[PDB]
Amino acid sequence: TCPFYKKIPGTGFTVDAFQYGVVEGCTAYFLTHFHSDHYAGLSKHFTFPVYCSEITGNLLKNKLHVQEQYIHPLPLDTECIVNGVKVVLLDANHCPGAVMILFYLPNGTVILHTGDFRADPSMERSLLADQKVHMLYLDTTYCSPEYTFPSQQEVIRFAINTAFEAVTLNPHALVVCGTYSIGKEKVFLAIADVLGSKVGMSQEKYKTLQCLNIPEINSLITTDMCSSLVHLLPMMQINFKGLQSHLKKCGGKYNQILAFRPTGWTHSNKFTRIADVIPQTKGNISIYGIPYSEHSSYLEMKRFVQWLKPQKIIPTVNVGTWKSRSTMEKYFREWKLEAGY
Ligand code: NI
């Protein structure tokens, strides 16, 4: 049964609610982004209207085989009427195709559902600027002050400089980057650009990348592993055993691997600056964990909410424990007292 924080009161609508069967009263199912915890339940047999971005729609059709007649893509930054209710989709600064949804309820209430997001000051000049929001359904993944990490630009700077140094010292080194979902494509694209290489990957991952509307993508990626010196592999294979086994398959072309695991936050963030990060090494294999996040830091989240000044907040992440829920409620009250709304 569908939980309350996935329902939009005063409408026929749900958000990211595909794993509960036929939801009673639901006339349109919104999908914020193509990540498995959110799409869980969709398949080619789904027969209700799905509303989403163009990119999410490409993935639904090609990867999950949802039939075209049930896919309803909407442009961003554009007022649209859905089953008699005005909606707007906004870029969520998460993975490709990820949106926030603004719902203008027939009674005058305005609701923002962030989906998953990485808050940014640029959002303060979107269509959010123009009116008041009563209810915020908020991605609270990192809602605690211990969660710090650097900008995405600092992280990419570190990775580019690391890869270019290693391969210039040793032209026979291979770079490998882990992946298990869409998102974080800048990591592998930036490294391949500095090295003058295409990114090599499986047929299944190439298929997924071809759904994302990235400019000039045919110039950047390939299924011909032999022609490429940046390879993508499943995240599960980014360990000493998995990488040893991959180096065997490369036909003595390479004699060293430098690999990247983009994670979210890890507790080595509490002590170490990005500049100071070091790898784990065994023989001719080195593995860097790099803190590339597609969710808001605590400070970014706090800034956004203090700017928006919502009347009520409904968390969508970490809602399963009493300790979590109490911690989050305390920070929301601090923020409101500090800012005066
Ligand atoms: Ni996500």
Side-chain angles (χ1 to χ4, degrees), residues 1-23 25-203 205-215 217-240 242-247 249-269 271-281 283-311 313-341:
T1 63
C2 186
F4 74 101
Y5 70 79
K6 299 179 178 272
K7 295 189 187 164
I8 308 294
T11 66
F13 302 155
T14 54
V15 181
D16 299 348
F18 299 88
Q19 59 165 298
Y20 307 109
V22 178
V23 173
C26 186
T27 52
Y29 294 74
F30 284 79
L31 182 59
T32 60
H33 71 293
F34 196 76
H35 278 163
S36 62
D37 277 359
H38 300 259
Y39 70 70
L42 273 163
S43 67
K44 72 157 75 168
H45 309 296
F46 201 80
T47 54
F48 295 95
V50 183
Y51 286 83
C52 59
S53 68
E54 177 182 353
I55 288 162
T56 296
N58 298 341
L59 294 158
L60 292 183
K61 180 193 168 174
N62 293 287
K63 300 290 291 192
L64 300 181
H65 306 292
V66 176
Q67 303 163 47
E68 195 137 67
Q69 76 176 130
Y70 307 101
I71 304 167
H72 297 258
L74 310 176
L76 303 184
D77 301 324
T78 301
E79 299 180 321
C80 294
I81 308 311
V82 176
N83 296 354
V85 177
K86 181 159 75 167
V87 306
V88 170
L89 300 187
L90 309 161
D91 199 276
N93 190 38
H94 186 50
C95 61
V99 299
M100 315 190 287
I101 312 158
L102 255 195
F103 297 96
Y104 292 82
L105 263 50
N107 68 0
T109 300
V110 179
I111 291 174
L112 178 62
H113 195 301
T114 66
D116 284 346
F117 87 142
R118 185 163 186 178
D120 192 73
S122 68
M123 298 173 175
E124 301 169 21
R125 301 167 281 283
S126 60
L127 304 198
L128 291 174
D130 310 42
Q131 92 292 275
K132 180 187 180 54
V133 172
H134 300 80
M135 311 194 80
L136 179 59
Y137 286 67
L138 178 61
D139 173 9
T140 46
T141 301
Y142 296 128
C143 187
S144 190
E146 76 271 28
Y147 302 117
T148 64
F149 32 76
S151 67
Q152 287 176 169
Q153 192 278 329
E154 299 170 74
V155 178
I156 290 303
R157 180 95 276 208
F158 172 86
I160 282 167
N161 285 3
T162 302
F164 180 81
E165 174 178 317
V167 172
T168 298
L169 292 172
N170 182 192
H172 299 275
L174 176 61
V175 178
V176 184
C177 291
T179 188
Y180 43 32
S181 62
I182 62 167
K184 313 189 183 184
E185 290 80 8
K186 195 68 175 174
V187 180
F188 52 86
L189 298 168
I191 291 171
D193 175 80
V194 80
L195 298 175
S197 183
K198 294 188 173 186
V199 187
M201 62 196 68
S202 72
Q203 290 184 262
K205 183 72 180 181
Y206 181 93
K207 176 179 188 190
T208 300
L209 295 187
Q210 286 291 162
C211 302
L212 310 183
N213 294 346
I214 290 171
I217 193 65
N218 299 325
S219 67
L220 316 170
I221 60 174
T222 190
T223 52
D224 181 4
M225 307 297 286
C226 290
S227 71
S228 162
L229 59 140
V230 180
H231 298 175
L232 305 190
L233 287 186
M235 197 75 84
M236 290 194 75
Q237 192 156 15
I238 308 307
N239 52 71
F240 297 123
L243 293 165
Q244 277 167 207
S245 172
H246 187 70
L247 189 56
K249 298 164 211 137
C250 290
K253 207 158 183 296
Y254 308 110
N255 62 8
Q256 181 187 344
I257 289 183
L258 177 105
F260 298 87
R261 297 180 347 80
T263 62
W265 173 94
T266 73
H267 186 65
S268 49
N269 277 276
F271 307 131
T272 319
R273 285 186 137 58
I274 185 64
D276 297 310
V277 163
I278 63 161
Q280 290 194 230
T281 295
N284 60 347
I285 307 188
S286 294
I287 308 174
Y288 286 89
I290 60 176
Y292 193 92
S293 180
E294 294 183 337
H295 299 270
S296 313
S297 75
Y298 170 83
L299 293 171
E300 288 164 356
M301 190 189 303
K302 181 181 179 277
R303 178 185 169 116
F304 178 84
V305 174
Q306 290 181 307
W307 171 86
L308 197 67
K309 301 182 175 51
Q311 292 181 356
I313 306 175
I314 301 163
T316 64
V317 188
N318 305 309
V319 302
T321 76
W322 302 111
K323 184 187 194 191
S324 279
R325 289 192 150 291
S326 183
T327 294
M328 290 183 297
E329 291 178 353
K330 282 170 41 258
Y331 290 129
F332 304 150
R333 178 63 62 190
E334 290 177 12
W335 299 352
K336 180 180 160 80
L337 294 166
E338 182 191 20
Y341 54 102

